[PDB]
Design an enzyme around this catalytic site. Structure first.
Site, PDB file in Angstrom:
ATOM      1  N   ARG A  51      16.339   4.825   2.051  1.00  0.00           N
ATOM      2  CA  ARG A  51      15.680   3.531   2.069  1.00  0.00           C
ATOM      3  C   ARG A  51      14.225   3.722   1.619  1.00  0.00           C
ATOM      4  NH1 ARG A  51      16.828  -1.265   4.044  1.00  0.00           N
ATOM      5  NH2 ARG A  51      18.732  -0.367   5.026  1.00  0.00           N
ATOM      6  N   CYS A  62      20.717 -10.559   6.000  1.00  0.00           N
ATOM      7  CA  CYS A  62      19.987  -9.309   6.164  1.00  0.00           C
ATOM      8  C   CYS A  62      19.603  -9.120   7.619  1.00  0.00           C
ATOM      9  CB  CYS A  62      18.679  -9.367   5.341  1.00  0.00           C
ATOM     10  SG  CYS A  62      17.577  -8.006   5.650  1.00  0.00           S
ATOM     11  N   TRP A 104      17.442 -10.788  -5.057  1.00  0.00           N
ATOM     12  CA  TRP A 104      17.693 -12.024  -4.319  1.00  0.00           C
ATOM     13  C   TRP A 104      17.190 -13.214  -5.116  1.00  0.00           C
ATOM     14  CZ3 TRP A 104      20.583 -11.274  -0.032  1.00  0.00           C
ATOM     15  CH2 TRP A 104      20.422 -10.107   0.728  1.00  0.00           C
ATOM     16  N   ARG A 131      12.202  -2.097  -5.119  1.00  0.00           N
ATOM     17  CA  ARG A 131      13.161  -3.162  -4.852  1.00  0.00           C
ATOM     18  C   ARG A 131      12.492  -4.367  -4.208  1.00  0.00           C
ATOM     19  NH1 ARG A 131      18.724  -0.814  -4.479  1.00  0.00           N
ATOM     20  NH2 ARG A 131      19.217  -2.349  -2.845  1.00  0.00           N
ATOM     21  N   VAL A 159      13.974  -8.521   1.148  1.00  0.00           N
ATOM     22  CA  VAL A 159      13.652  -9.484   2.222  1.00  0.00           C
ATOM     23  C   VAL A 159      13.496  -8.720   3.525  1.00  0.00           C
ATOM     24  CG1 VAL A 159      14.678 -11.487   1.127  1.00  0.00           C
ATOM     25  CG2 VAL A 159      16.115 -10.036   2.568  1.00  0.00           C
ATOM     26  N   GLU A 186       7.513  -5.648   5.772  1.00  0.00           N
ATOM     27  CA  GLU A 186       8.127  -4.695   6.696  1.00  0.00           C
ATOM     28  C   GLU A 186       8.545  -5.453   7.944  1.00  0.00           C
ATOM     29  OE1 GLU A 186       9.354  -1.646   6.768  1.00  0.00           O
ATOM     30  OE2 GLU A 186       9.794  -2.205   8.854  1.00  0.00           O
ATOM     31  N   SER A 187       9.867  -5.546   8.186  1.00  0.00           N
ATOM     32  CA  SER A 187      10.311  -6.400   9.282  1.00  0.00           C
ATOM     33  C   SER A 187       9.761  -5.928  10.632  1.00  0.00           C
ATOM     34  CB  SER A 187      11.863  -6.494   9.317  1.00  0.00           C
ATOM     35  OG  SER A 187      12.465  -5.246   9.698  1.00  0.00           O
TER      36      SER A 187
END
Lengths: 344, 344
Positions: free
Chosen positions: B5, B36, B69, B127, B130, B145-146
């Site tokens: 990742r 996601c 997306w 990339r 989302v 960054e979630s």
């Protein structure tokens, strides 16, 4: 976008009256894959009818490439599984794996590398699929029969009665008293379960996939009801604590082991290890969703040697996941479910 | 053949002291996919912290093609918990059902999330992931960054614009912070990202290492929750299911960020990760009773979870976008149901 199974081309029988194929020891052979549920029917039936010394067996590799089933290049011939033993992970096993008596046997009579060699010897103009199982005549070097539903009738018939012992001759997997029941059950199990899982997993359009998967689980529900009703009756008759007496009569048709059980078993025993993930037959699993089928299949596997010792979960999982490139493009075999079959 | 990742590139924050990104209503936007699990973290947190009218939301299409997306070509929608988003065979990958498959990008009409990325940084060359937390004033990505977006939402930054009940909610309480961080760390590597390292592996050796690691760590979570349930059963008695569940969480005795981060994976596990990412030793519903109770409690009993969980987007995204896993794009209909009811 649907899958249409081809009709089998070799449809002869063996009998004392037959002009070509008469019963004898040391004459006929059974070529199978351990991964194939159709060929599995024949192995189970060969064992239950005491025919392992009468009809030899050889086993193709579990990997099915574009040139068809292949072989590697007495105690084994007359064994319930042709001598194949499961090795003591799948990642180290490549598709061209060469573990003799683990991945495959040889073809002992002619040294053929491909099952197609047998088909072409029998019919040099053969143009269809080179399927297992094959019931082979060593005398004429021809295929007697390559339809599993008929091979199992040949095996159960009186043809080989002179060459078997007294206990096996008496076994009858298609008693006349249950024959309409067996034939009914077989008909809808074939279309909706045995073949239903293939029509589901090989569908190339989702509309067909969805129609067929719904049909699979609708018919598993029918089987589950039949078994639930039978279990209720057995529990009243014997008491739930007497599990052993209950299981001794716990079958799909009647109160004894029949062909209907054999034909269902070869699909159900593959259902959780393969068909759920690989053929997307995944509303639920047998173990999670079908208690009575689950009990029934564990009784057959754990308590009957003809089922347990002809069931090779490595061949099952590797064949499907490694051969079907349009389903599993990288050929990575899932490790689950664990275990392949739960204990009884 | 391992999946690595990428590190997220936009890592800024929003605060009253910040020279550039100060808190306000009507200024920031949250762009997500409902498929996601990373973006899902931010939707749950946005709801729990009462920020749906403070920070608008827009939703990309569930289908992820080579160009990234995408959006389809209203007050209630932008301020809804899921951006207003309301058989699979009839739904094609080019489906254009407005407010069902996707929303529009309402500020600029961009058709691609890449348009936001290039606007922020014309030299961007990773990339186009989302979730995106977007600043309408500077037209930049604040943070993609979630794990940091959910800290921003939970912080005091937006407290002037919410009601007091939401202001007091704290998903990262000081007394639990270190335990939240330590749990989050191994859940990230082994579960959140563990399912992706498993399903995106292209060599079997990597698949097997990662899948064993996933289940080893689910076993760790299950143990934590089993021990916690045992303590609650003693505190309250097995009969008081509502008082038990009111304290039944991964870290401490209240809902925290640790639950949110685990949930987005666990809720996807049976619908997708088992079949599609081959994470299939067992399922949550069959194999993990305490995780199963915990995730059902969150889904059914907390609207922030239920009404941000879109199983059509989840199943369609993964099965229709990952051609090297599912080459024909056929979405499995099972398991049924997507999440079981919490039956007492």
């Amino acid at each position: 976008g649907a899958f249409k199974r081809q009709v089998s081309s070799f449809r002869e029988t063996i009998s004392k009256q037959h002009p070509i194929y008469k019963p004898a020891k040391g004459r006929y052979w059974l070529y199978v894959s351990l991964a194939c549920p159709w060929a599995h029917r024949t192995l189970i039936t060969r064992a239950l009818k005491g025919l392992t010394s009468v009809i030899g067996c050889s086993v193709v590799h579990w990997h099915l490439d574009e040139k068809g089933w292949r072989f590697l290049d007495l105690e084994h011939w007359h064994d319930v599984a042709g001598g194949i033993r499961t090795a003591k992970s799948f990642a180290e096993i490549k598709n061209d794996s060469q573990r003799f008596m683990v991945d495959a046997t040889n073809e002992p009579h002619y040294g053929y590398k491909r099952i197609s060699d047998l088909y072409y010897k029998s019919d040099p103009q053969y143009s269809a699929r080179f399927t297992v199982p094959v019931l082979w005549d060593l005398e004429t070097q021809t295929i007697v029969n390559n339809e599993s539903s008929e091979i199992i009738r040949i095996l159960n018939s009186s043809a080989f009665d002179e060459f078997v012992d007294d206990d096996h001759k008496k076994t009858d997997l298609v008693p006349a008293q249950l024959k309409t029941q067996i034939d009914d059950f077989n008909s809808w199990v074939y279309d909706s379960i045995n073949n239903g899982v293939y029509k589901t997993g090989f569908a190339e359009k989702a509309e067909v996939y969805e129609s067929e998967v719904n049909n699979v689980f609708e018919h598993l529900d029918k089987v589950e009801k039949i078994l639930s009703d039978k279990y209720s009756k057995l529990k009243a008759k014997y008491g739930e604590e007497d599990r052993q007496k209950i299981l001794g009569e716990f079958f799909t048709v009647g109160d004894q082991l029949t062909e209907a059980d054999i034909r269902l078993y070869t699909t159900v025993i593959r259902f959780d290890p393969v068909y759920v993930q690989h053929f997307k037959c995944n509303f639920t699993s047998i173990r999670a969703g079908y208690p009575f089928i689950h009990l029934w299949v564990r009784n057959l596997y754990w308590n009957y040697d003809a089922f347990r010792y002809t069931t090779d979960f490595d061949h099952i999982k590797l064949h499907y996941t490694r051969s079907h490139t349009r389903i599993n493009p990288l050929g990575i075999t899932p490790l689950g479910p664990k275990p392949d079959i739960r204990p009884l």
